[PDB]
Each structure stands twice: as structure tokens, then as C-alpha cells.
């Protein structure tokens, strides 16, 4: 059957959130010269990280709040990334790598498929 409102809305939420997250990460790097490491994580965007300590952490962080994905799971983050300098993604409805339809992985590297 043709996609309906809910499925489309979830995909769009995922795209919106990944864009916002990468925007925050890019600003973190603009201030600090490097991206948060995988271990420091997306949490580095809301709370000043350690190991290593950032050189110029913005008062108030880089994002107002970390969103959860359309299935209630934290977005995923890798630095250095496998698909780009940073990977920012949701594994979709199946919560596992790969898949298709609602289970499709939506990432900063494949945004074009879901725009």
C-alpha cells in the first residue's frame, strides 16, 4: 500500500532531528576544533564533556535538548564515522542495522533518499 501520514511523519522527524544534531555537532567543532568523540557522544552537545576537555565550550551547550527518534530510542553517533567524518543516524523501526521501509536506517549520509 502507498505510504500514509504516520510513516511519512516519522521519516520526516528522523530527517529533521539528524539535521539539527549535525548542525549542533558542526557548531561544536567550529568552537572546539574537533568533533566530540564517539565516547563523549551526542551528550557533549548538552553537557560540557571531558577526556578531552573542550577548548571553547559554548555556555548553554549546542542544542536545547537531545531528541529521541520516532521509536523512542536515542539517536546514534560515531566519530570518526564509517560513512562520513561523523555518522548521525537512527536504525529505524527494527532497531537493527539495515532493513527497509519503516525499518530503513536513516542517517546523515543517506538523507537524499528520505528528503
Name the residues that contact Zn ion, by CB under 5 A: 22, 26, 115
Site residues for Ca ion, 54-93, by CB under 5 A, read 91-92
Choose from Zn ion, a second copy, Ca ion, none: what does 92 bind? Cβ within 5-8 Å by kind.
Ca ion
Among the candidate windows 12-20, 34-42, 72-80, 97-105, which touches a second copy by CB under 8 A?
A: 12-20
Joined grid coordinates for residue 75: 539517536
- What the block records as the C-alpha cell of 71 is 521509536
- Say if residues 89 and 114 touch (Cβ distance below 8 Å): no
Q: What does the angle CA 40 – CA 20 – CA 16 come to, to the nearest 5 degrees?
A: 130
Place of cell 553537557: 47
9 binds a second copy (CB under 8 A): yes
What is the DSSP-derived secondary structure letter of residue 58?
P
The binding site for a second copy (CB under 8 A) comprises 3-5, 8-9, 12, 15-16, 19-20, 22-23, 26-27, 30-31, 108, 111-112, 115
Amino acid at each position: 500500500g502507498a505510504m500514509g501520514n504516520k510513516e511519512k511523519a516519522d521519516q520526516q522527524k528522523a530527517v529533521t532531528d539528524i539535521v539539527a544534531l549535525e548542525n549542533a555537532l558542526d557548531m561544536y567543532k567550529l568552537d572546539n576544533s574537533v568533533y566530540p568523540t564517539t565516547d563523549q557522544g551526542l551528550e557533549a552537545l548538552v553537557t560540557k564533556p571531558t577526556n578531552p576537555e573542550p577548548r571553547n565550550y559554548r555556555e548553554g551547550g549546542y542544542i536545547k535538548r537531545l531528541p529521541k527518534d520516532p521509536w523512542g530510542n536515542d539517536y546514534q553517533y560515531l566519530s570518526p564515522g564509517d560513512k562520513g567524518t561523523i555518522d548521525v543516524f537512527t536504525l529505524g523501526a527494527d532497531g537493527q542495522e539495515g532493513g527497509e521501509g519503516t525499518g530503513a536506517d536513516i542517517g546523515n549520509w543517506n538523507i537524499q533518499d528520505f528528503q
